[PDB]
Design a protein around this ligand. Structure first.
Ligand SMILES: Nc1nc2c(ncn2[C@@H]2O[C@H](COP(=O)(O)OP(=O)(O)OP(=O)(O)O)[C@@H](O)[C@H]2O)c(=O)[nH]1
Ligand SMILES: Nc1nc2c(ncn2[C@@H]2O[C@H](COP(=O)(O)OP(=O)(O)O)[C@@H](O)[C@H]2O)c(=O)[nH]1
Ligand SMILES: [Mg+2]
Lengths: 102, 188, 61, 439, 430
């Protein structure tokens, strides 16, 4: 609101999904001259679909170009690692066309 | 401690005290006079000896400690901080004659030299709680005379007198400190 | 796939017995309090005097 | 041209004041918005509201009440309630910090900063009044702010106005049921404060009304609102003669001429009848004789005291309904006849009787039903000394070794004030014992 | 109005807050982004007690996070609801305390505390009407037991008339995780007794016992234990945020519970607690609420309450309920157990009612009891402390940082004196 140049900011962060136990990790890389305490955003833990629920995420619930609800926040997944592409084509799960970040 | 400090310091043999009493009841003669004596090395031991329960150590320590307090002079002020632990533990020994004797010793300490009450004021927390429990306890014989005040074992009256004399010398903050520590105390 | 999906990430970071309590005990409306049960009812100049005497043994609670 | 001013202090005072003000509005036909409806009129005559309300010139009315508190929770709740449009919104005085059951806090630390505003409001309200009858003051005694503020207000008023009559409707702590642990201290201090400053005090403890609600209303899980409704009905029965036509009217000034034999003894205990539900009330006669017998039945006393343990000094009792003076006199004859009720020797007759024509009103959604005849009785009797004795013993147990005393010492009150209240209650006990002996 | 700020330090207190804050947020309907999505209008009326307003309409907890090692706070930030905290209030060191009370109270903490003192001063000055402060810490750890205690002393020096609250997790001798626990526990309690206005003691061992016996759950965890502590904390101040028959704030509890200034160590408990299987079958009534209130196994402490006599008890109820049955049950509990209640305080129970239930419960109860049963806790702590100190074991690390053994001796003397004075009123008779 008070920033003269900007009215809406964009935070970029990377997502890891461990295949050993289905746990999820989120962290945002540091950017110079940002003035934001940037580091780990979500600990290594399972994340339920909704708050106060026991229904967790699985690997088939993740895709590119989609919105994901993490603790009432809505992330937009825009791009995926190359290794994930081979993993998903091996498992038989299709992907959509990845775009670039606004 | 397994063995009393005054015991292992008397069989030590370096005491300048010797009873050798030829008088009314008892007395003690000293091979060293106090102005040569160093109080730092001795007064903590003498106050420690008050805890002892078996003869002749009680009488020896009592007489030595009281005469040190009487004729020490200004030197008592310097050795004040070290004396707090023995007087606390002797009071905690919860024995009635030991409390009576140490109670008299505290009185004579406070009245012995000037400018010591204020220095002792920070230290009520160590010494008052033991007196707190037994302030309430007292004898109620009724109408009859009590013949026993010749010697002083009435713990309630003695502690009340000690609080009075203590407050008379402590200063302004002494009253609030002692009221904080013991609730039933009453202003004088 | 019975008890060896287990690991340190998943097991400790999962609350066990203190998640949402079971239903049929959730049923209170937080906004609805006293002085509003009665003093915030409505009030009316003329009361409704109709009273019913059911032929049923009154339930005990 | 006759009016009274109502003062509420403490959370209990507010929770009984709102209850009685609902009853007053329903009885006078005033909508909760404060406006009398253009149509649908239920109240004949004029200036009937003038006892408790004052005309704004065109339309609604404002009550002659003031609310005092130091904790804003209940004040905010009432200002958010449906009676928001009714009260003047700057006579609901609210503080910032609660006294937290500490009488010293409410009498010496934070009440002194609110007392000036309260007295200014009192002067402003009294200036409108022209035929001021007196003040009613409501406060639960087992609370720090209630007790301290009540004491301070009575102290200021007794010197500001002088001879104006004041009535304190105190709720003393129950014999063994209690909500707090420090309440004996502030109760004793407050009674010492108000003894030499209140003209009439009413006993309103909790166990008695609890047992009344259990036995008669057949309610096993009652709440404070039903209690407050009972006290509200008592207030209405007390003051209905002041503003409503009757065969034998009784004024508030006609209490300090009938019920206080000596200046010291001005604590009275009440009773009210009938207490019966609409599922139950309609099979009996509800006749004057049986209702006045239930009135003097000892288990129906409004306060937990046994009248059989002492003599009766005076009894002022008011009927409202279609009662007949012959019937009332016949019933008083039987009451004087009966065995277990005996009066003090130097009082040949001890009854004051009042009669009022219109029956008491009922609150919708309440507990009570509608009856022609209701009796509200106020008695001064020698039996009241037992509560003073037991609270004295409870105070003694804690003061024996000076427990809880430093939280009162640290708020500016000296040490010796407690013993002043102690000796005052001892003197009161000796006074009761001395008066109670025959000649 | 009459609001409370939050200050927590050490990894233990950080984990405590890491649950307490989303407990409060779920009670008040606050989303992890700080935007209100609640249902009841009462959820915002007293929102000023714990939350400050920011531009854009969001709310921020008024919590101050301190630690001498940054890993714990960097982990709690990634936790759920971790973004609520303002990044300004985080204060952390770069060295760590090494579980060393001397190093966390003399060398590093004294230097570091300037910034956290400035920020807490700013927070206290900002609020309209300060009621008091609350701290959560464990006495088995160096940085906690040192910095928290020095902070308590500093804050008390500047705000003598405010409320000071502390939730202390004291080290039990059975489930011990650190060799040097007795030293810092004793040194900490010495300072805490003369500064804290009220302290509530919690044991991990009692937490495990409750989880294993009452809940009958297979895998207890620090999450469950922290949730216990969080519910217990919220129950104390819920009636301050919500209306009731008898609202009772911290000052009222303090007046009604503490007979003498040096006795402000309480034990707490929560009801009801039932297993998942039997949660449906039980029918919530005030009688079972009270019998689980006063049950010995339900208390949050390893101290046995029937080994001593209650100085006083206090209960805070949540939910719509009639007062007659409440106080009648209280009277019945007194008449049935007169032997455990001290005789020179008649009617030594306070009862308070709050109309708003916790999220999802028909009725709830928080109990706080001051009794003589806590003497044995200090007894075993002092026993272990003196067993270690007689040989001067582990003492050089502490004495190499400017403090001497006279401090330990005086701390032990004061600690034992507190034990004796606390035992005194147990045997007092009228
Ligand atoms: N009859 C009746 N008595 C009440 C009610 N509420 C509180 N009380 C009485 O008030 C006493 C305690 O004082 P409170 O009125 O609750 O509080 P207070 O007088 O404002 O004093 P503080 O608590 O410091 O604010 C209790 O012992 C109750 O007996 C009520 O709704 N009805
Ligand atoms: N309740 C609870 N206790 C914990 C948790 N983590 C550690 N503890 C306890 O804290 C103690 C160690 O405290 P410590 O880390 O030295 O405190 P610090 O020095 O302030 O960081 C251990 O004995 C544990 O029992 C937790 O997540 N919850
Ligand atoms: Mg209050």
């Amino acid at each position: 609101v008070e920033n003269p140049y900007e009215n809406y900011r964009i935070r970029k962060c990377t997502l890891y999904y461990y295949l050993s136990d289905g746990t999820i990790h989120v962290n945002e890389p540091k950017i110079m001259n940002s003035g934001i305490e940037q580091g780990v955003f979500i600990k290594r833990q399972q994340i339920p679909k909704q708050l106060n629920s026991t229904d967790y995420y699985t690997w088939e619930d993740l895709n590119v170009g989609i919105n994901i609800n993490l603790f009432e926040r809505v992330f937009r997944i825009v791009d995926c690692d190359s290794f994930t592409k081979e993993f998903f084509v091996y498992m038989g799960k299709k992907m959509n066309s990845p775009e670039r970040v606004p | 401690v397994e063995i009393n400090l005054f015991k292992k310091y008397y069989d030590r043999g370096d005491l300048p005290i010797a009873v050798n009493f030829h008088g009314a009841h008892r007395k003690i003669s000293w091979k060293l006079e106090p102005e040569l004596l160093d109080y730092h090395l001795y007064l903590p031991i003498f106050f420690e000896g008050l805890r002892e329960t078996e003869e002749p150590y009680k009488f020896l320590a009592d007489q030595g400690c009281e005469e040190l307090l009487a004729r020490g002079g200004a030197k008592i002020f310097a050795v004040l901080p070290q004396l707090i632990i023995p007087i606390k533990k002797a009071l905690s020994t919860k024995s009635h004659p030991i409390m009576c004797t140490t109670l008299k010793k505290i009185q004579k300490l406070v009245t012995s030299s000037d400018m010591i009450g204020e220095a002792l004021v920070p230290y009520y927390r160590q010494i008052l709680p033991v007196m707190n429990m037994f302030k309430n306890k007292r004898l109620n014989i009724g109408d009859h005379i009590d013949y026993s005040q010749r010697k002083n074992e009435n713990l309630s009256d003695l502690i009340q007198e000690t609080l009075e004399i203590l407050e008379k010398y402590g200063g302004e903050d002494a009253y609030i400190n002692i009221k904080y520590m013991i609730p039933t105390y009453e202003s004088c | 796939s019975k008890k060896t999906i287990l690991s340190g990430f998943m097991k400790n970071n999962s609350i066990v017995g203190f998640k949402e309590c079971l239903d049929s005990q959730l049923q209170l409306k937080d906004s609805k309090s006293e002085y509003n049960d009665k003093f915030q009812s409505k009030n009316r100049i003329h009361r409704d005097t109709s009273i019913f005497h059911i032929r049923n043994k009154s339930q005990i609670i | 041209m006759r009016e009274v001013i109502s003062i509420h202090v403490g959370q209990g005072g507010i929770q009984v004041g709102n209850a009685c003000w609902e009853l007053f509005c329903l009885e006078h036909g005033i909508q909760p918005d404060g406006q009398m409806p253009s149509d649908k009129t239920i109240g004949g005559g004029d200036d009937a509201f003038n006892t408790f309300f004052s005309e704004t010139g065109a339309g609604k009315h404002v009550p002659r009440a003031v609310f005092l508190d130091l904790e804003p929770t209940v004040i905010d709740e009432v200002r958010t309630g449906t009676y928001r449009q009714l009260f003047h919104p700057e006579q609901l005085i609210s503080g910032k910090e609660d006294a937290a059951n500490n009488f010293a806090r409410g009498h010496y630390t934070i009440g002194k900063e609110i007392v000036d505003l309260c007295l200014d409001r009192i002067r402003k309200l009294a200036d409108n009044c022209t035929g001021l009858q007196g003040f009613l003051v409501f406060n639960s005694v087992g609370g720090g702010t209630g007790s301290g503020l009540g004491s301070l207000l009575l102290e200021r008023l007794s010197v500001d106005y002088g001879k104006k009559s004041k009535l304190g409707f105190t709720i003393y702590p129950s014999p063994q049921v209690s909500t707090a642990v420090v309440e004996p201290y502030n109760s004793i201090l407050s009674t010492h404060s108000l003894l030499e400053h209140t003209d009439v005090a009413v006993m309103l403890d909790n166990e008695a009304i609890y047992d009344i609600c259990r036995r008669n209303l057949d309610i096993e899980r009652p709440t404070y609102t039903n209690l407050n409704r009972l006290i509200a009905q008592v207030i209405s029965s007390l003051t209905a003669s002041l503003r409503f036509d009757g065969a034998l009217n009784v004024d508030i000034t006609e209490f300090q001429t009938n019920l206080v034999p000596y200046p010291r003894i001005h604590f009275m205990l009440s009773s009210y009848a009938p207490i019966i539900s609409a599922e139950k009330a309609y099979h009996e006669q509800l006749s004057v004789a049986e209702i006045t017998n239930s009135a003097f039945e000892p288990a129906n006393m409004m306060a937990k005291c046994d009248p059989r343990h002492g003599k009766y000094m005076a009894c002022s009792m008011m009927y409202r309904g279609d009662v007949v003076p012959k019937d009332v006199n016949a019933s008083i004859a039987t009451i004087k006849t009966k065995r277990t009720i005996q009066f003090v020797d130097w009082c040949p007759t001890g009854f004051k009787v009042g009669i009022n024509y219109q029956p008491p009103t009922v609150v919708p959604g309440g507990d009570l039903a509608k009856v022609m005849r209701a009796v509200c009785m106020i008695s001064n009797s020698t039996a009241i000394a037992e509560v003073f004795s037991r609270l004295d013993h409870k105070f003694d147990l804690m003061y024996a070794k000076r427990a809880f005393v430093h939280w009162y010492v640290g708020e500016g009150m000296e040490e010796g004030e407690f013993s002043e209240a102690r000796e005052d209650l001892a003197a009161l006990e000796k006074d009761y014992e001395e008066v109670g002996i025959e000649t | 109005m009459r609001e409370i700020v939050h200050i927590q330090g050490g990894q233990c207190g950080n984990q405590i807050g890491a649950k307490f804050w989303e407990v409060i947020s779920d009670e008040h309907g606050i989303d992890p982004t700080g935007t209100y999505h609640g249902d009841s209008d009462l959820q915002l009326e007293r929102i000023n007690v714990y939350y400050n307003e920011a531009t854009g309409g969001r709310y921020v907890p008024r919590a101050i996070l301190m630690d001498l090692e940054p890993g714990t706070m960097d982990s709690v930030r990634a936790g759920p609801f971790g973004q609520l905290f303002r990044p300004d209030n985080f204060v952390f060191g770069q060295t760590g305390a090494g579980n060393n009370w001397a190093k966390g109270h003399y060398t590093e903490g004294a230097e570091l505390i300037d910034s956290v003192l400035d920020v807490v001063r700013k927070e206290a000055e900002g609020c309209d009407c300060l009621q008091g402060f609350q701290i959560t810490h464990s006495l088995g750890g160096g940085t906690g037991s040192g910095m928290g205690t020095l902070l308590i002393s500093k804050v008390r020096e500047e705000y003598p008339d405010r409320i000071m609250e502390t939730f202390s997790v004291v080290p039990s001798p059975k489930v011990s995780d650190t060799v040097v626990e007795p030293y810092n526990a004793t040194l900490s309690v010495h300072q805490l007794v003369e500064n804290a206005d009220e302290c509530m003691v919690i044991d991990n061992e009692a937490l495990y016992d409750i989880c294993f016996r009452t809940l009958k759950l297979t895998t207890p965890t620090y999450g469950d234990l922290n949730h216990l502590v969080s519910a217990a904390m919220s129950g104390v101040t819920c009636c301050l945020r919500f209306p009731g028959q008898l609202n009772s704030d911290l000052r009222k509890l303090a007046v009604n519970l503490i007979p003498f200034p040096r006795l402000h160590f309480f034990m707490i408990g929560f009801a009801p607690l039932t297993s998942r299987g039997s949660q449906q079958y039980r029918a919530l009534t005030v009688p079972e609420l009270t019998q689980q209130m006063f049950d010995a196994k339900n208390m949050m402490c390893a101290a046995d309450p029937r080994h001593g006599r209650y100085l006083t008890a206090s209960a805070l109820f949540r939910g719509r309920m009639s007062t007659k049955e409440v106080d009648e049950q209280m009277l019945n509990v007194q008449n049935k157990n007169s032997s455990y209640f001290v005789e020179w305080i008649p009617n030594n129970i306070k009862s308070s009612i709050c109309d708003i239930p916790p999220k999802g419960l028909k009725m709830a109860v928080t109990f706080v009891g001051n009794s003589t049963a806590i003497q044995e806790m200090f007894k075993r702590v002092a026993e272990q402390f003196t067993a270690m100190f007689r040989r001067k074991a582990f003492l050089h690390w502490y004495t190499g940082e400017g403090m001497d053994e006279m401090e330990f001796t005086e701390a032990e003397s004061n600690m034992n004196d507190l034990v004796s004075e606390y035992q005194q009123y147990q045997d007092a008779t009228a």
